[PDB]
């Protein structure tokens, strides 16, 4: 468990990686599409951060419309995340400063 806690989702690097991905796409990207383009190595740990994106930059997230994303972890088990629908856009996200 010491080693497991040693390595974790460094949201600092993920912040810039996501920002660069939105800059490259420069289009409204959902959570499922972001997961496809960016393979999360920690599952919901990443998703919360991305939701932290939408709610931090004012990008309203819709709960009625539900997308999905199938992702396999390190040991091979595959999970289907029922993400909400969001409208992540690079402009606003780059506008907001990050800690």
């Amino acid at each position: 468990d010491f080693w497991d806690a040693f390595n974790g989702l460094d949201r600092e690097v993920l912040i810039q990686q996501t920002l660069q991905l939105l800059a490259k796409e420069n289009r409204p990207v959902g959570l499922a599409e972001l997961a496809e383009l960016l393979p999360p190595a920690h599952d919901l740990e990443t998703f919360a951060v991305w939701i932290g994106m939408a709610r931090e930059a004012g990008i309203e997230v819709i709960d009625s419309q539900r997308e999905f994303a199938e992702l396999s972890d390190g040991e091979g088990r595959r999970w289907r995340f029922n993400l909400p629908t969001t409208g992540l856009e690079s402009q606003a996200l780059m506008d907001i400063d990050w800690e």
Partner: protein
């Protein structure tokens, strides 16, 4: 050991035993008169595990499962690995300016397999 022999590291077994006793007491309290299962099976514990190691928190969750308690854990975006292993949803709460809001999220393991085209 009539008296607890020792812990699993700085109160490891001690914390495990205390949490197990607390869970049993909660289950008994929620269990109706002469009932094996508590009618009110939901337990909320804010700041789920801040003073508890990952080794012990999994044990507390397992104990909560054994006593038939459905628990919702509140964490400050911390201890995501064990929460993800031992849960199947998350209510991401974010407050912007003076007003706050929620965003529900859920996930579930597809039956598929642990791995295909490999050792079974």
């Amino acid at each position: 050991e009539s008296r607890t022999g020792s812990q699993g590291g700085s109160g490891g077994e001690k914390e495990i035993i205390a949490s197990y006793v607390l869970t049993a007491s909660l289950s008994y309290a929620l269990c109706p008169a002469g009932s094996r299962y508590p009618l009110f099976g939901t337990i909320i514990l804010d700041e789920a595990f801040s003073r508890s190691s990952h080794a012990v928190a999994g044990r507390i969750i397992a104990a909560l499962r054994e006593f038939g308690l459905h628990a919702v854990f509140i964490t400050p975006n911390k201890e995501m690995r064990l929460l993800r292993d031992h849960t199947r949803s998350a209510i991401v709460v974010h407050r912007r300016g003076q007003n706050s809001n929620m965003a529900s999220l859920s996930w579930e393991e597809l039956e598929r397999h642990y791995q295909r085209r490999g050792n079974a």
